[PDB]
Design a protein that fits this description.
This is part of a larger assembly, with chains A and B. Chain A is mostly beta strands. Chain A folds into 2 domains: 1-45, no CATH class; 46-114, N-terminal domain of TfIIb, CATH 2.20.25. Helices cover 0% and strands 25% of the residues of chain A. Chain A contains no helices and 7 strands. Chain A has a 4-stranded antiparallel sheet, with no helix packed on it. Chain A has a 3-stranded antiparallel sheet with strand order 1-2-3, with no helix packed on it. Chain B contains 2 helices and no strands. Classes of the chains: A mainly beta, B mainly alpha. The structure holds zinc ion (2 copies). Residues 6, 8-9, 11, 28, 30-31, 33 of chain A line the site of one zinc ion (ZN). The site of one zinc ion (ZN) has 8 residues of chain A, from loops.
């Protein structure tokens, strides 16, 4: 799924096929380096892209004075009353008006969607 | 000609009193606006 880099010239490793043993190999074409491919998968395509936004959500967003905050929904980790909420804030997010909450109070940074 | 010269008798105008409704009507309009705001808030929360 990801991209692996060479350790000699630090170029990109492309998938190669080991004919003699029948195992997936990652061979850089800048040099002769070849390495064993652990994941055995090359490419993954989520065209419907059911991606989670909280992995793209940063904790310092809770410091924004322009964002609304409610004490209704508390933090799961630290149980703090006040939490800032906002929508997807992302394009190509299909049709989603759901709420992504970020817990306030310093060093918590917890986030959750409901 | 004849209608303008008759309006010379009756007269026509527009004024502040022509642009205000009864206090009951104002209360009804405010109640309708409040109900609309409550309904749209409920819709926003339901979509949330
Ligand atoms: Zn290389
Ligand atoms: Zn918290």
């Amino acid at each position: 799924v990801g991209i692996r880099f060479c350790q000699e010239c630090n170029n990109m490793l492309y998938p190669k096929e080991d004919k003699e043993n029948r195992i997936l190999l990652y061979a850089c074409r800048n040099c002769d380096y070849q390495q064993e491919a652990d994941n055995s998968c090359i490419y993954v395509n989520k065209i419907t892209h059911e991606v989670d936004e909280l992995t793209q959500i940063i904790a310092d967003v809770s410091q924004d004075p322009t964002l609304p905050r409610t004490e209704d929904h508390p933090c799961q980790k630290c149980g703090h009353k006040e939490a800032v909420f906002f929508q997807s804030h992302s394009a190509r997010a299909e049709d989603a008006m759901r709420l992504y909450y970020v817990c306030t109070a310093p060093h918590c940074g917890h986030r959750w969607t409901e | 000609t004849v209608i303008n010269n008759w309006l010379l008798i009756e007269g026509h105008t527009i004024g502040i009193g022509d642009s205000i409704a009864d206090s009951k009507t104002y209360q009804d309009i405010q109640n309708t606006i409040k109900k609309a705001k409550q309904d749209v808030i409920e819709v926003i929360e339901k979509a949330h």
